[model samples]
Target: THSRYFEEVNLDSISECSGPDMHLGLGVNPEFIEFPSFAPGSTKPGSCVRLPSFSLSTTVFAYTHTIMGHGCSELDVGDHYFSVGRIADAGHEIPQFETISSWFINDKINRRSCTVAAGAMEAWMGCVIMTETFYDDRNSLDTGKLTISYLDVFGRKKEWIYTRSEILYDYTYTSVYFSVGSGVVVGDTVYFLIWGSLSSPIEETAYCFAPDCSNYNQRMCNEAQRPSKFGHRQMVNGILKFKTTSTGKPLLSVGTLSPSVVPFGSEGRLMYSEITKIIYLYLRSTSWHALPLTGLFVLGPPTSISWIVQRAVSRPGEFPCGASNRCPKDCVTGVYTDLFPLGSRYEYAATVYLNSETYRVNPTLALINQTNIIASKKVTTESQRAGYTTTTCFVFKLRVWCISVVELAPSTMTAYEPIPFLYQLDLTCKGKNGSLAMRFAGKEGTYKSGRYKSPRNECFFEKVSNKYYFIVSTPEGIQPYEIRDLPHIIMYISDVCAPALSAFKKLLPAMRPITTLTIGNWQFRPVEVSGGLRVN
Candidate 1:
């Protein structure tokens, strides 16, 4: 037994004859066929007897015939007719044309004139031997019948019949589509998944296709288009992969993780593609709140007891985020020292040690109190490691000088004895650190200076006759004199008060004195001396 898928055969292309042309006992030979030429009953043998087009939906051979001419009024042509004959193995073994029945193509053959040249003909007799390509395996043979019934030239109906059988084979068939997919990253390679596009219980292999992907059912690729290390066209596991570190050219639409303009010290985290096979790169915002701090430090106390600390972290298989981002909820609670994922929380502890006793002061009250601020300067700078940072200001002589500093511990513990020195303070909690620089200011009097002129003079306070005087060189040639009660003037000099301050005393031989001294709303009575101005 055998099976077959059914097919349609255009008998026209499969045969040697053109519609069974033949000679019917002394009648003119049936010339080759031409459709729509002479009408069916025309009798004009030359133009009307040609074969009109017709076909059969059958298994083997079955001749389809139509007689065109009836006896014409012409001299000697007898009754014109056509006939289709019986079988030789249903004509499968060979083509046979034997007459089974005869009919006048025109009813008017014995009566009405055969003058109609062009006309529509009835759909007459044609037998069909239909043999299906597929059949039950148990039944080795399939059979079909051929039947014929049509109107003769006289308008009377006629019929003919025959049956044919053929051996058949056994068979089954099905088809599918490529629609869904995804991907995974393993080391440098990326494997694609098409589980949704697959079916079940079928034992055939599946495959992938793309400019970057080598092959599929599962596909593998790398940054390089070189043949995959994963071997070619393996059986369907439904995973198709690629690589990012390979030596081949990049895959067209696939995106790789990369650093952008977030600056040096700054960082970003990965963002994956939502609907396509493509992966996305990281994003780092330009805004300040989103930028993480890089390094933090402070200017100091006279003994240079200052604090300076910077941020240090190490992570593998992980990336950092902006300051505005909240730490990951599931993160390990201390300083990070492992494989970290996005939003993972971490801490930085800044410890401080103050030498308060030697400086003879109350450490806690002096450094921790919110009182006493003299002058402050706001400094702005960028770091190589931190990217852009928020602005920080250092206020003079305040307990807590910074805006976000946190004190974790005290240098000396005390309640009863009232420990007045060596208080230690810890800096920040998560990602923040700090230091302190201190100086003492009081009744002993503060000194300041500024340049006089290129005239070779630097001014500072000079005591004369137990009184302080404003001192400066005069091109007018005068000795320095005393001017009292200056009342803490805010001194400003070019390199002296504006940028720098210096003092000189050994060259104090000749100096000028003031007769009338005035300083911003405060005027002092000047004392007259031997010279226009007297030196102390």
Candidate 2:
């Protein structure tokens, strides 16, 4: 009855053989999917299985103090669709999954370990999984706890937690590192953030201790020995004027404290006198601050002497005076004009004095004088009918000598002009003592051409041959002569003394002898002045 020996085949059994295994794909997919079962009313035990497991790994080169995150792939079972949309679109992108050679999971005494044989794709997926898990654990840990963990590809896991002592140690370490090297490092990255702080502390400190006076002395000496450019033309003087109390007493102050002894009357006078003498001597001998003399000479015959003198008096007002056109008007003045029939000569002189007291330290007192010889003379004789008639007699007096004084104010020093006599006197005094001091009076009046004219008058004294001679000269030649030649003279009439005469001393030692020449019309008519004078 049975020709064919075929047995009955069950479709359910075949379908069951092709279905995925549930135990192998547990917790592997983001969503669930169902498959057909062997029975009509009941499905197979493993019909609705989960997807396959995926291993994720990632490596990044991030800079210090920087944050980075990455996404990873999902796993699915064979012949089954893994619904990864939920996980893939869960605020991150999905990565691709690749097959691996082998995978093994193990549970040890206190941890779980897994071994995986995979390519670069699997390794990256593992890194992402590790990062996500670590972040989640870190967020769940207590604020004061350190719950960082390390994972090896072999599935070895170890948690790093902070012990009580370790917590304290880490706190201190972080503080030290932050203060010393803030922002220096970050996870998986290395860089530098240099720390800066106050370089200097705020505190009071002493500066100059044990200052040596030797340095100052050496500097002074060096300066004194320096060569000068001007052949000692101008002198410099140093003045240290100290405040004084009533009754002619020095205020007795040094620095900020009063001196132990207060100099009064004779002592004060003696101190000042000594200081003046020292200054004068120093100005004469020292060569530290002397300036060059700008001088010129005028040569002419006796008949042209008046013309030369007039020219000297007017020279300063010429096109180019000292440095500027607006210079003091009285910079140059005719100090003296003289005519002498005995020698058949005419003489003239002019002088200029700077006004500033400070200027007096290096005063350029220029004195120029010219003399001319007379070529001829005319004589007029009056003798009427001398033989027989009686004659009426007439008496006349002749004045041979003339004297004058020009008073100068301290303020007028800038405008002070020395008369011929004063110019000669200044030259003589400077030549002998290297310095001189004179008392400046005020203005005066003189009778010239039967009219009164105001003229400057000043008293001047000089020490020569160990004797002091006092004389007064006027800007205009019209004052009685008072000539005193004594061993010493007193000059106590000035309202203000000139600048300290010490500066002048500094320039004396460096002075060199110089000669000046002036040409006359006869000699220099064709030749022009060319060569400059040597100062030092």
* lDDT (C-alpha, whole model) for all candidates: 0.21, 0.17
**Which numbered prediction scores highest in lDDT against the true structure?**
1
Misplaced by over 4 Å in model 2 are 1-237, 243-245, 252-285, 288-366, 369-443, 446-536
Residue 295 accuracy (lDDT) in model 1: 19
Q: In model 1, how large is the Cα lDDT of residue 424?
A: 14
Number of clashes in every candidate structure?
Answer: 44, 48
Q: Looking at model 2, which ten-residue stretch has the lowest summed lDDT?
A: 263-272
**Tens-digit per-residue lDDT, 1-536, candidate 2:** 12111111101101011112210100111111122211011023222211111111121101000001111111211121111100011121111111111122121111111111111111111110111223453424212222222223243333333322332220111111010001111122211111111112111111111112223333232222221322211111111112211133212110100101110000000000111111000001112111111111111121110111122211111222222222211112111111111111112221222212221222122222232211211111121101000000000011011111121211121212111111011111111233322111111211011111133355444444454443234332211222322225343435211221122223334321221112321110111112235434
What is residue 148's positional error in candidate 2, in angstroms?
Answer: 93
Q: Which model scores highest in TM-score?
A: 1
